[PDB]
Design a protein around this nucleic acid. Structure first.
Lengths: 205, 666, 85
RNA sequence: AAUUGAAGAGUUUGAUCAUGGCUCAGAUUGAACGCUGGCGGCAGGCCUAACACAUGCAAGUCGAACGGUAACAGGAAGAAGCUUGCUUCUUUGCUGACGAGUGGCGGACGGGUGAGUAAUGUCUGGGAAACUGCCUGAUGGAGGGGGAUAACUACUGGAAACGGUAGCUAAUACCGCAUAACGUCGCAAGACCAAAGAGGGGGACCUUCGGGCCUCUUGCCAUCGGAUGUGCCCAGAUGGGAUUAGCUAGUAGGUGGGGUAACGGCUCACCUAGGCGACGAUCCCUAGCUGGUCUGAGAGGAUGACCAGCCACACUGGAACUGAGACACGGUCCAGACUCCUACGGGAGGCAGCAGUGGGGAAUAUUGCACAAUGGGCGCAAGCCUGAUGCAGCCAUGCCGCGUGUAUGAAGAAGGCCUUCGGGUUGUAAAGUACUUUCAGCGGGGAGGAAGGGAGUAAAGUUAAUACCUUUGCUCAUUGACGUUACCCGCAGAAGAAGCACCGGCUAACUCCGUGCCAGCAGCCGCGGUAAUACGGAGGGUGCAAGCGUUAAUCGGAAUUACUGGG
């Protein structure tokens, strides 16, 4: 139940980059971005509050590599909790182990960070964890297992991570490859071009 | 604690033409092999019995009676066979069949002369036939003391010992030496036996000419190594009713009857596609075939199976590739001639029944639950020979009948159900009179359905003799959608087997371009209900050479009618003729019966075509009307006492003898 | 029905047949009583009342007619004698 | 901190507003079907025929109540298998034990079912006239007699299931008699009722060497309470119909007897003439009730599978017996329907227990392992029994996680689809190249569910007492079905793992070709009669994903039964 297919071909559609070739070069181009997410590629997408109001969450979903089910529950979650309900849905995503590993630097792409967690190449407070879903909490201590450490991938991984805007709410290492999870990401940090009362309106009607 | 040497397995079938002694012979075998008594119904398909350190599996059921198929099914699974013969029936015309259909598969067998006590019971007379009819190389293995009413003891040449029977209850027997006279008669037959056994063991050949006697052990080896190759057939004897020659026939079993090992491996196919032998090793993949389902009141569905490779295990999981299904075998079971022995496993070459499984119907291939999802062969092709008309009375029964086959077609795929593609009524494919007959009891009884049972109808055809030409007018001018169509055609008969040909014979265009399609769909159409009885008026060429029209009134449709009128009448006018179906048939028969065979066919509105010999038989080709061709099986098998078989194909349609013209006006 | 405690059956037979008797005998006596009253025979009653009492109470603490039955009985019966006796 | 949450669209007209139906987008499911399908975790699994049922299992247990020996183990005066310590039979019940029999306790629980039942029901809340095994507190009893019986022996009828005579015998079986109050009866005075012994261990002493005796446990009877259970009354709520408006004779009330564990027309004689009913009786149809559950913003609507409470039923109708308890789910008698056996005379049985069969149906799974865990029965105990229960098997049925790779790759390959032939697109997609290896596969490692019981000891309880018994430690060897357990460690190679629907509008997604009111689509509006974004194929795309659809169905949208909230 992972997406699996042509990663880039997605960003094209959402009209952004979601960092799915995240890998190396960037601001795509060298890909084919934009004016043809299909064959009537040119064609203007004029559309519905429904079409726009979808594309937002649909896109977000794509960003984190979540599937509509888990996602719904995230939303119902956001709902269940106190706080701006879109904001919560965002945190809920941000606490994803997988998220919190690309966000450390350990992983080149989120889609890869996860590749590691599945393979128990990762620990929290001393227990190997290996479910991407795993919700991380303030004061946790995510890290690479010693075995399979400073390896191939994780190298450039931690690397280009620095060139990234670089988070805040996590202290990371590199020698260690250990990483604190320090607090729960504010609406303020991470964001701008992402519109929650849309992907709430959605599940709201 | 091996208890399974394999080389101790005897899987045998009792075949032979009806009357015989098959059934009776079996219950008997199942009394000796298990009378035990030591200081301490063919109840389901196959049964196990022990005879001197040897397990025997029997499947008596043959019957021959028209429909064999079953006989030829067990035959494939099992390895050995006794072809019981009725000693008495001497001018025996049906001793045959049975066998000529055995080597037909490739399996070894010994012969038994059963009623050696009933009048006319002449042993030789059989052999004077077993080489005269089928023509094999049987080997006298015994000589009876007291032909028929004077049935006392018997003698085994190979072992030159004499036994006797003081009664017929099967108790007071004994091995009493040769009674004065006789003796001499033996020798010679015991020499030829050894002389026969010579064509196998060179050792039993020299020692012959040198003056030494082959060892009672190397002698057996010859006979045995000789039968198993389908070269010889050891003949024995004894009144099975009087319990005589049975306990000796049983030895005859092991001594000459093949073991699951002496037999040639089953071929199967991988999921990829490639033949491959299936080795009788109780440690290779699990490969077993099924062959008989049965509903047990106590344990439910039972699926008797013949293992070939690996080994099925009680409380495991199997997999049927045939119907891609994961069956869960829970309990294994072996049928003892009187109780339910619950064992724990069947190793390759062994036979019994599993309990569980739901999707496993006949001929299913069960492998391990990971083994190469392979499928054996099994391909048997016994089609039908006799069918009937079955019209389920009021639509009510038409249903009870649907369910009828919905369960009866699984409990016996030796038939076929078909809805005549031309007239509702459904056909019931059988394999001989009796067959369909006894279905007619169960399908009507244990299904309470009560329909009709007459004969099929015949797919007739209409056409004409003389070519005609008539007007096709329509016009309806009153005030608006005028409806104006009209055409003239050229109708002309074509050779019986011509088809449908129209002719766009319009000059400048008196009949617009756009309307011709429709004037054809009209003619083409009308030809549906004939002018005589209402059948597909066919075998003609049509020519549209004229017809006018109107600027506003005409219609695509208005023309389809006009043309459907020109035709609806040219056929009425050109003198119609009720054509009918002619078949191609080929009766395979010994020119012995031939004489009348051809006759009967002539007196069937048919006309003969030839007979180019085949094998020992001879084939006859010719045409016939499907009407005067019904229930031919039980008519061919009449002029041939069974030695007759036929095929059938369609060919053409042809006029009815006029006398049959006004006949059909029904 | 085959199930060890077919016995249970035969047990309650012996049982019934026993209580049957007593119970009977007991009624028999209490009947002797209302008879007396029912006629007017003050003393004969009392007498037969005395006779039944011990048998009542007894058969009760024995079990087969526990407690308040006797009560009720010796009760109303009593009430009856000093009704018109 | 703890119900804080309410969205509309399409379609009447040439156009409009309104009214008004119809239709869709959401959630939900004990589902089914079509296509497709990798793993696991947890739940679910006959909704129809309360249809019929082969077989096996689902209730036993105590020898510390009893006469006992038939089985298998042992021993034994004494006889022997002898191969002069290894030991075999006559027996002998001598004890460890145990078939059959008596007795005791349990078979009124557990488990199944929804057929009946619109009130001997359920929920909510009060009440009084009651009984209550096993557990429990209090106080007394526990004296002394008797006659039976099964088992068994003889003889005997039966095919069998099961009897028939006559013996003989035991107890915690039965019955007397004594005893008798804080019991019952009675204002009182009086009167009246009960019972069972059994084991363990013991110095002196000793006797009919079995024991009396001493002591300890456990049982037996009685009344009073406790607790649990149960019966019982009352008012309120508890579906539809008036195209059912009248109902009722034990009927409503009284009295008196009788009745029950108890109040009571519960039953009867008698008197009264009442009693119910538009606040809906009666009649007819339907239904187990609840906690809950789905839906909704809520109010409502719909519902009452699994889990838990109550009720009801046990092939159908009827009935009592035994008992603390039943009018009994593997009890009894009758009647009925029905099947089985039979030697023909006569007999046996009821899966709505677990599994399984047939039948019905769109549909619903194994004749599994285990008493190791909790729990129930009997027992002092150990034990035995337990289809309760714990588990495993089957099915994508649901929910929940996981995987099916991760990077990198360009003038952007070929092929395919479009193309105004410039190219476009599929497309970082592929391939190439690095890197990872969870999960399936292999092989090792390896938790917890295990508390207790068993002996050894140490005491402290009692007691004549250090024996024995109760608790307490102490020590020692041990008790899982699951089970190749969870979890961990390695081995190899991307290796074994993607599919379904949609793309005219509602509605996210479009072009080409085929077709020519045909073939066909279609939830509504409506597509199709030669350039079809609607049919069918392809390319492309959109949505979902080991699922996707489709059908079925409840609520929602529906302010469209409008209390909230309309006319």
């Amino acid at each position: 139940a992972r997406y699996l297919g042509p990663k880039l071909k997605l960003s094209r559609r959402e009209g952004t980059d979601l960092f799915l070739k995240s890998g190396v070069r960037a601001i795509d181009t060298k890909c084919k971005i934009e004016q043809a997410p299909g064959q009537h590629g040119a064609r203007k997408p004029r559309l519905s509050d429904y079409g726009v109001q979808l594309r937002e969450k649909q896109k977000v979903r794509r960003i984190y590599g979540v599937l509509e089910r888990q996602f719904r529950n995230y939303y119902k979650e956001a709902a269940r909790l106190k706080g701006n309900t879109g904001e919560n849905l965002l945190a809920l995503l941000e606490g994803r182990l997988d998220n919190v590993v690309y966000r450390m630097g350990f992983g080149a792409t989120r889609a890869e960070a996860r590749q590691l967690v599945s393979h128990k190449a990762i620990m929290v407070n001393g227990r190997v964890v290996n479910i991407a879903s795993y919700q991380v909490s303030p004061n946790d201590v995510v890290s690479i297992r010693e075995k399979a450490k400073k390896q191939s991938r994780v190298k450039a991984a931690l690397e280009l991570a620095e060139q990234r805007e670089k988070p805040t709410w996590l202290e990371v290492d590199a020698g260690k490859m250990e990483g604190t999870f320090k607090r729960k990401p504010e609406r303020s940090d991470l964001s701008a071009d992402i519109n929650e009362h849309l992907i709430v309106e959605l599940y709201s009607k | 604690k091996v208890e399974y040497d394999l080389k101790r397995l005897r899987n045998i079938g009792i075949a032979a033409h009806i009357d015989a002694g098959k059934t009776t012979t079996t219950e008997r075998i199942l009394y000796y092999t298990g009378r035990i008594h030591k200081i301490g119904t063919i109840t389901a398909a196959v049964t196990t019995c022990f005879w001197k350190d040897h397990r025997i599996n029997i499947i008596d059921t043959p019957g021959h009676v028209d429909f064999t198929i079953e006989v030829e099914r067990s035959m494939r699974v099992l390895d050995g066979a006794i072809v019981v013969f009725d000693s008495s029936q001497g001018v025996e015309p049906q001793s045959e069949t049975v066998w000529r259909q055995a080597e037909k598969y490739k399996v070894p067998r010994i012969a038994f002369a059963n009623k050696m006590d009933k009048t006319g019971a002449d042993l030789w007379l059989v052999i004077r036939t077993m080489q005269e009819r089928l023509g094999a190389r049987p080997v006298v293995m015994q000589l009876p003391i007291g032909r028929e009413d004077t049935f006392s003891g018997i003698i085994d040449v190979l072992r030159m010992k004499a036994y006797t029977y003081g009664n017929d209850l099967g108790t007071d027997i004994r091995e009493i030496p040769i009674p004065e006279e006789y003796l001499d008669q033996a020798r010679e037959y015991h020499e030829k036996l050894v002389e026969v056994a010579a064509d196998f063991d060179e050792n039993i050949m020299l020692k012959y000419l040198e003056g030494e006697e082959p060892t009672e052990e190397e002698l057996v080896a010859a006979i045995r190594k000789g039968t198993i190759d389908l070269k010889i057939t050891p003949v024995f004897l004894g009144s099975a009713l009087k319990n005589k020659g049975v306990q000796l026939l049983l030895d005859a079993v092991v001594d000459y009857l093949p073991s699951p090992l002496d037999i040639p491996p089953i071929k199967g196919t991988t999921p990829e596609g490639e033949v491959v032998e299936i080795h009788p090793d109780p440690n290779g993949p699990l490969a077993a075939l099924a062959f008989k389902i049965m509903a047990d009141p106590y344990v439910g569905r039972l699926t008797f199976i013949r293992v070939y490779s690996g080994t099925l295990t009680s409380g495991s999981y199997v997999y049927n590739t045939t119907k891609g299904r994961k069956e869960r075998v829970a309990r294994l079971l072996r049928m003892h001639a009187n109780h339910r022995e619950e064992v724990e496993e069947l190793k390759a070459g062994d036979l019994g029944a599993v309990v569980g499984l739901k999707e496993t119907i006949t001929g299913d291939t069960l492998v391990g639950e990971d083994a190469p999802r392979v499928i054996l062969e099994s391909i048997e092709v016994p089609e039908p020979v006799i069918d009937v008309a079955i019209e389920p009375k009021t639509k009510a029964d038409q249903e009870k009948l649907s369910q009828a086959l919905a369960r009866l077609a699984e409990e016996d795929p030796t038939f076929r159900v078909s809805t005549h593609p031309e007239t509702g009524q459904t056909i019931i494919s059988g394999m001989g009179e009796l067959h369909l007959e006894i279905i007619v009891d169960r399908l009507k009884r244990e299904f309470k359905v009560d329909a009709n049972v007459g004969k099929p109808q015949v797919a007739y055809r209409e056409t004409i003799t003389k070519p005609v030409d008539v007007e096709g007018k329509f016009i309806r001018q009153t005030g608006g959608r005028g409806q104006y169509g009209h055409v003239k055609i050229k109708v002309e008969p074509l050779p019986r087997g011509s088809g449908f040909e129209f002719v766009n014979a319009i000059v400048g265009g008196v009949i617009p371009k756009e309307y011709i399609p429709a004037v054809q769909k009209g003619i083409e159409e009308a030809m549906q209900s004939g002018p005589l009885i209402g059948f597909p008026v066919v075998d003609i060429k049509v020519t549209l050479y004229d017809g006018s029209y109107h600027e506003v009134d005409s219609s695509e449709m208005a023309f389809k009618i006009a043309g459907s009128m020109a035709i609806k009448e040219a056929v009425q006018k050109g003198d119609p003729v009720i054509l009918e179906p002619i078949m191609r048939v080929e009766v395979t028969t010994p020119e012995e019966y031939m004489g009348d065979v051809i006759g009967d066919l002539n007196a069937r509105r048919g006309q003969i075509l030839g007979m180019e010999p085949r094998g020992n038989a001879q084939v006859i080709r010719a045409f016939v009307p499907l009407a005067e061709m019904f229930g031919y099986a039980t008519d061919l098998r009449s002029k041939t006492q069974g030695r007759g078989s036929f095929v059938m194909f369609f060919d053409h349609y042809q006029e009815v003898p006029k006398q049959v013209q006004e006949k059909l006006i029904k | 029905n085959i199930k060890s405690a077919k016995k249970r059956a035969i047990q309650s037979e012996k049982a019934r047949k026993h209580n049957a008797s007593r119970r009977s005998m007991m009624r028999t006596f209490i009947k002797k009583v209302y008879a007396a009253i029912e006629a007017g025979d003050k003393a004969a009653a009392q007498k037969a009342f005395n006779e039944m009492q011990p048998i009542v109470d007894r058969q009760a603490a024995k079990g087969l007619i526990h407690k308040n039955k006797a009560a009720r009985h010796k009760a109303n019966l009593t009430a009856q004698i000093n009704k018109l006796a």
